[PDB]
Structures are given as structure tokens and as C-alpha cells.
């Protein structure tokens, strides 16, 4: 059985930063792609990160591109998001996914119209200009 699970997420203060996981499992770690997705209440879901764990290749959309990082951890089998400069639109359900990466390299189409093979069930990300009213 495979299985994709989010950790990390959290409510955060407006600039400040999180670090989310993805936690493979079930599959050869080293054959796919994993993305990093993300959608708010009212919007269409969107890829925000891309790494192959096959050639090392990344994406990432301009929206979130110098803010957020992704990496990978073949002795963890795990992937990182290091979202740092939050800014409230940020806020939103964070999913992993993963695809084999077989002849394709990272780009918008993979986290986009390609689709996913294996999917995370999301870890919310909340981001607030007064983070110190809900803790």
C-alpha cells in the first residue's frame, strides 16, 4: 500500500516561516516526482513545488518562487517545503503527491494538467496578521 503523509502545517505569523513533510511510503522513492499542492476555500487547487527524486530537477510557480524550497531525503524518504516570507494569501489545505518521474523533468504542466499518481490528505497552513489571537 502507498501512503503520503503531510506534517508541519500550523498557524503562523505574516512573514514568518514552516516547514512541511511529505512522508512516502509503498513505492520506489527514487523513481518519482513528488509535488507540493495547495488549495484555499473559494479556489482552484494549485502546484506550488516540484522536485524529482529521478534527476533532481524543480519547479516552482512565481507565485511562491525564492519563498519556498523543496527538497528530498532519500534515507527519510521524505520531502520538505521550507516556506518561508508567509504572507496571508499563503493560507491554505498544503497536499503532497507523487508521479513517476520516467521521462519527464519538473515544470507548471507536471503540477499542473499532468495529474498525480498518489495523493496526501493535507495539512493545513494558516497564515495571520495576528497570529498571538488564536494561542
Known amino acids: 500500500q502507498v501512503q503520503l503523509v503531510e506534517s508541519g502545517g500550523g498557524l503562523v505569523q505574516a512573514g514568518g516561516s514552516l516547514r512541511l513533510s511529505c512522508a512516502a511510503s509503498?513505492?520506489?522513492?527514487?523513481?518519482?516526482?513528488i509535488g507540493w499542492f495547495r488549495q484555499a476555500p473559494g479556489k482552484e487547487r494549485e502546484g506550488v513545488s516540484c522536485?524529482?527524486?529521478?534527476?533532481?530537477?524543480?519547479y516552482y510557480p512565481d507565485s511562491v518562487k525564492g519563498r519556498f524550497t523543496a527538497s528530498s531525503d532519500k534515507a527519510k524518504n521524505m520531502v520538505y517545503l521550507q516556506m518561508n516570507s508567509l504572507k496571508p494569501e499563503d493560507t491554505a489545505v498544503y497536499y503532497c503527491?507523487?508521479?513517476?518521474?520516467?521521462?519527464?523533468?519538473?515544470?507548471?504542466?507536471?503540477?499542473?494538467?499532468?495529474?498525480?499518481?498518489?495523493w496526501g490528505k493535507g495539512t493545513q497552513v494558516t497564515v495571520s496578521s495576528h497570529h498571538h489571537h488564536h494561542h
Open positions: 503527491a507523487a508521479v513517476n518521474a520516467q521521462g519527464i523533468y519538473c515544470t507548471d504542466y507536471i503540477i499542473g494538467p499532468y495529474g498525480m499518481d498518489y
Open positions: 509503498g513505492f520506489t522513492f527514487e523513481d518519482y516526482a
Open positions: 522536485i524529482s527524486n529521478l534527476d533532481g530537477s524543480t
